[PDB]
Design a protein around this ligand. Structure first.
Ligand SMILES: [Mg+2]
Ligand SMILES: [Mg+2]
Ligand SMILES: [Mg+2]
Ligand SMILES: [Mg+2]
Ligand SMILES: [Mg+2]
Ligand SMILES: [Mg+2]
Ligand SMILES: [Mg+2]
Ligand SMILES: [Mg+2]
Ligand SMILES: [Mg+2]
Ligand SMILES: [Mg+2]
Ligand SMILES: [Mg+2]
Ligand SMILES: [Mg+2]
Ligand SMILES: [Mg+2]
Ligand SMILES: [Mg+2]
Ligand SMILES: [Zn+2]
Lengths: 120, 79, 50, 158, 205, 45, 161, 71
RNA sequence: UACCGUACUGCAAACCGACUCAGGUGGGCUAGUAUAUAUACUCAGGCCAUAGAAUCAACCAUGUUAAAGGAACUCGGCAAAAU
RNA sequence: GGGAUUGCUGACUGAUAGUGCAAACAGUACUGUGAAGGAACUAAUGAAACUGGGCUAUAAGUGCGCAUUCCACCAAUACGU
């Protein structure tokens, strides 16, 4: 079970697991609180895998660390690594899930919202 | 002229020049090894006779879902 | 007696003299901080960090 | 965007002693980050089958607790955590000399390193997997051994 | 050209480009005028737009393999001409010609031949500027299809104040008392429930 | 339980940036440090 | 004569500067006939320290110039040997000049870019410990006759019965 | 104890005559390896000579001797 | 039974003096001849990296010895010697 | 009086000038215990001092990008495209 963060386990073999995109806010507004809860846990475990995998390689993230490591902007073949692109999509997914949850919390009427702002 | 107004203006001035700690912030970051700065942890107890006692209701509990295995939503949406 | 070494370093005295709270404790210290802000200094006090 | 505020040493000295909260809620939607460091390749083969190591070291953020790392690993990854040891690290200083020579200096965000000692899951405990020699002979051999050479200087050729 | 770049007033206020990529063009000025080429890429810069054509403005590029001295390899490469230095070739007389943005029927805007009868057979066709489709190469693991991602799972019909939806499970009722389908057994295993149980069993035995 | 060439100072050790351990850090700077071994009651030098 | 051009402006400026000094070297001081030359840039020595050795090899033939450089313990003599060996390599393999007739007809030392430093005099006064640099230009002409070797070649201690 | 005026280029050149080095009128050259040194100095491989091929010494036969090796 | 400190340096090339500055910098532990933490040699331990190489300059600094005298020197036995 | 947008405004300046700053991070580096002081650095071209050697001894065209006015759709009252 430490294999989950230990490696992609599909990257040592020359195959790409994730060939897709990250979640958007309008799709995430249509999912229930339980579905958002499960997606949040799956996305955080994916975030740990991607951070570990780009920590084994010495590649930056966020595009602000790239200026710190003296790596050139765009023309470096480092922003094009699969783990960095997946990491940016996973951060977008987690940020959008947080935004949807506060929107639903601000969309309430009674003291239930004071409890809705205690689990987010 | 008030004390809170001066601190708020200081923080608004510090909102600019923020991000990955450049310049004077590189030296100022080493204050955490000089004056015992308390980090952003949540306290779980209190000292009574010098022995720390963790209050059991303040221990961390994580409400993980029943199964995240064969759950039909992945972190990635197909294009 | 050789001079030049008037600066004897001490973190307690540095924070207790030129720190934020002694600057805020008095009115003229608060206008000192206000004109530090109006000049545009990046470091407001000797003990500021993040 | 709202970000990290400045803190002041006199302010933390004056408004000191953070109090414990009155109620702790079970944490739905947690915001906690872990990553492994580099493993030896034989440890990587040790993880590839049966998914276990006795000692794994992690990078975290400095706002975490040994209880939080142990609870998170036990809750999410199904491990048995025996003990956690945490080290606070400063960021690395970075130098990125500019178009005019300025010496632009950066500092990475501070991180906490956890040393997590694990425990064999259930019934699989055999994978701890380790003649004699006298310790008097060990010390007597390590006393007649040649000394380590003094460290060469970076300009010195040997 | 001018070497300042930022002093230049930004041109192309309305974004319309008469030259597109992959089309035959005539070089008007420079070391090789009278020659023709196919546009490989247009650099759409508002201040200094360039056009790279097929094998015409050839200058030797010194590609620097990283080294302090004279270790490098040299490759001939098409240097970028200015956007103003090129003009489209009409397919009839081989001379450069001005492209106009004529509107045909259906409200669409096309590129005509600059004639007093701008209609069909004078339109110069413009190719599309995008082809990066990840739709081919989908269905990998850790992905979800669009139809699955657009389920209307959320409904406000439930979620009403339900302080007594506990079901009485040691701490799986604490979360729906603080407002929850099923906690994992491993999560409840993390907060150990056996420190008092061992003392109770030892006292009983 | 100890690597004595390291103890006498004639060999490199695990965590070679320490070079002078306190009472704790003797256990983890030892080159023959086994994680699977149990941890002693006092953790001496 | 270079009908082609470089891609970047920096390389083109450098190449044009190179052709301008190849014009200035021809039909100027000497020039004319085929000449092997070298330019050793940024020697980590002062101009006086290099000029101490350069006054010994001025006008000599090539073998006794190598002899005069190889018979002194100076640090500058090794750099002068490097410059003379580079000039000899250009003259013999890049050009087609005959050996054993090469004369060191032009050698001189020019200034280099300095690295300014600081020295700490007493009573608070500053000083300097500037690190000096220099350049070497060596021109090896070919004479019409093999010249007088100027230093008698004797047998070593090894050549003994 | 202090110069009253600035030294001219001609006066400086005249004063710097002691700093110049005299040329050596003899050199010992090895015909094989082309090495150069004084006639009183060994410049073969035992000394510093990475170009030595051993042809500098043309004869060295000494097989016979008898002694007690102290061990 | 949490949080912070734990590397390295700390009579010093890493602190305070613009410096790799002959200056300034707190507390504690210690073996023998031996007897006091003084003195000479030494234990444990550490060091002989930050200009090197020979040689009979004058002269300068710091000392050893000096025949017969002895403050006669000098503003003043100052400085040395002496107990 | 003061704080921000616009100036088919300038016989204002054009990198030792103009703000202290035209710049990857200027109220910065750096100086000072502190209040406080406070730089240099655009892109090409490459003058002199300086130091070695040598010697002497056709006020035009052609392309692009806009602005003005025509036109035809216009919110139909300042132009909207
Ligand atoms: Mg004193
Ligand atoms: Mg001072
Ligand atoms: Mg600790
Ligand atoms: Mg001392
Ligand atoms: Mg001083
Ligand atoms: Mg000292
Ligand atoms: Mg002694
Ligand atoms: Mg020495
Ligand atoms: Mg006597
Ligand atoms: Mg100025
Ligand atoms: Mg200037
Ligand atoms: Mg001014
Ligand atoms: Mg310039
Ligand atoms: Mg000139
Ligand atoms: Zn030889």
């Amino acid at each position: 079970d430490v294999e989950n963060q230990g490696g992609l386990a599909c990257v040592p073999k020359p195959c790409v697991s994730s060939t897709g995109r990250g979640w958007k806010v309008e799709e995430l507004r249509l999912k229930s609180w339980q579905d958002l809860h499960k997606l949040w846990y799956v996305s955080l475990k994916e975030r740990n895998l991607l951070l570990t995998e780009m920590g084994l390689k010495h590649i930056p993230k966020d595009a602000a660390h790239q200026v710190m490591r003296r790596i050139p902007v765009g023309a470096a073949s480092v922003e094009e690594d699969p783990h960095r692109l997946r990491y940016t999509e996973v951060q977008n997914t987690l940020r959008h899930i947080r935004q949807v949850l506060e929107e639903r919390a601000a969309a309430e009427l009674v003291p239930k919202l004071r409890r809705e702002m205690l689990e987010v | 002229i008030g004390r809170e107004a001066v601190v708020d203006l200081i923080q608004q001035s510090a909102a600019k020049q923020s991000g990955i700690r450049k310049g004077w912030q590189v030296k100022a970051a080493t204050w955490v090894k000089r004056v015992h700065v308390d980090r952003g942890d949540v306290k779980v107890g209190r000292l009574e006779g010098g022995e720390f006692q963790v209050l059991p209701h303040l221990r961390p509990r994580y409400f993980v879902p029943a199964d995240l295995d064969k759950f039909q939503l992945k972190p990635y949406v197909e294009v | 007696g050789n001079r030049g070494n008037t600066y004897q370093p001490s973190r307690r005295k540095r924070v207790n003299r030129h720190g934020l709270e002694k600057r805020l404790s008095t009115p003229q210290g608060r206008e000192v901080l206000l004109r530090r802000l109006r000049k545009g200094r990046w470091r407001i006090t000797v003990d500021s960090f993040r | 965007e709202q970000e990290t505020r400045l803190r002041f040493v006199s302010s933390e000295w004056r408004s000191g002693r953070p109090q414990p909260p009155e109620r702790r809620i079970p944490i739905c939607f947690p915001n906690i980050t872990l990553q492994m460091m580099k493993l030896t390749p034989e440890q990587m083969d040790q993880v590839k089958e049966t998914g276990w190591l006795r000692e794994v070291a992690f990078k975290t953020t400095p706002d975490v607790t040994k209880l939080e790392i142990a609870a998170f690993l036990q809750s999410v990854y199904g491990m048995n955590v025996e003990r956690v040891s945490t080290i606070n690290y400063l960021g690395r200083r970075r130098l990125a000399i500019s178009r005019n020579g300025k010496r632009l200096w950066w500092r990475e965000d501070d991180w906490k390193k956890a040393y997590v000692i694990f425990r064999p899951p259930a019934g699989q405990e055999h994978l701890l997997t380790r003649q004699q020699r006298p310790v008097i002979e060990q010390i007597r051999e390590a006393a007649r051994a040649p000394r380590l050479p003094p460290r060469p200087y970076p300009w010195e050729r040997r | 050209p001018q070497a300042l770049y930022r002093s230049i007033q930004p041109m192309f206020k309305t974004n319309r480009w008469r030259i597109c990529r992959d089309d035959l063009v005539y070089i008007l000025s420079g070391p090789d005028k009278g020659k023709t080429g196919k546009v490989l890429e247009i650099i759409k810069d508002t201040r200094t737009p360039q056009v790279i054509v097929e094998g015409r403005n050839l200058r030797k590029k010194k590609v620097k393999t990283g080294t302090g001295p004279d270790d490098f390899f040299v490759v001939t490469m098409e240097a970028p001409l200015h956007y103003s230095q090129v003009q489209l070739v009409d397919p009839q007389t081989g001379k450069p010609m001005r492209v106009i943005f004529a509107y045909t029927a259906d409200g669409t805007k096309v590129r005509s031949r600059k004639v007093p009868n701008p209609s069909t057979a004078d339109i110069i066709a413009t190719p599309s500027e995008e082809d990066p489709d990840p739709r081919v190469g989908l269905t990998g693991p850790k992905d979800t299809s669009a139809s699955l991602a657009r389920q209307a799972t959320y409904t406000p019909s439930a979620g009403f104040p339900f302080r007594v939806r506990n079901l009485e499970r040691i701490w799986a009722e604490l979360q729906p008392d603080a407002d929850x389908x099923x906690x994992x057994x491993x999560x409840x295993x993390x907060x150990x429930x056996x420190x008092x149980x061992x003392x109770x069993x030892x006292x009983x035995x | 339980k100890w690597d004595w060439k390291w103890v006498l100072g004639k060999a490199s050790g695990r965590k070679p940036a320490i070079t002078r351990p306190r009472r704790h850090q003797w256990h983890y700077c030892n080159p023959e440090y086994d994680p699977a071994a149990p941890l002693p009651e006092v953790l001496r030098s | 004569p270079r009908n082609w051009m470089w891609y970047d402006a920096d390389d083109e400026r450098e190449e044009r500067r190179k052709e301008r000094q190849r014009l200035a070297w021809a039909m100027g001081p000497g020039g004319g006939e085929e000449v092997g030359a070298a330019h050793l840039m940024d020697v980590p020595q002062s101009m006086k320290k290099m000029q101490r050795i350069v006054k010994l090899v001025r006008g000599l033939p090539y073998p006794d110039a190598v002899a005069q450089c190889s018979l002194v313990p100076h640090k500058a003599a090794r750099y002068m040997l490097q410059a003379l060996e580079a000039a000899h390599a250009d003259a013999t393999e890049v050009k087609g000049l005959d050996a054993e007739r090469l004369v060191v007809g032009t050698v001189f030392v020019t200034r280099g870019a300095y690295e300014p430093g600081i020295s700490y005099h007493s009573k608070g006064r500053p000083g300097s410990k500037t690190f000096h640099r220099s350049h070497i230009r060596v021109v090896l002409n070919q004479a019409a006759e093999r010249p007088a070797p100027f230093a008698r070649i004797v047998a070593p201690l090894m050549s003994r019965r | 104890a202090t110069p009253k005026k600035k030294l001219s280029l001609h006066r400086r050149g005249n004063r710097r005559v002691w700093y110049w080095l005299k040329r050596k009128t003899e050199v010992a050259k090895c015909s094989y390896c082309g090495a150069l040194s004084g006639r009183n100095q060994m410049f073969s491989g035992a000394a510093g000579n990475s170009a030595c091929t051993g042809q500098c010494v043309e004869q060295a036969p000494t097989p016979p001797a008898s002694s007690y090796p102290a061990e």
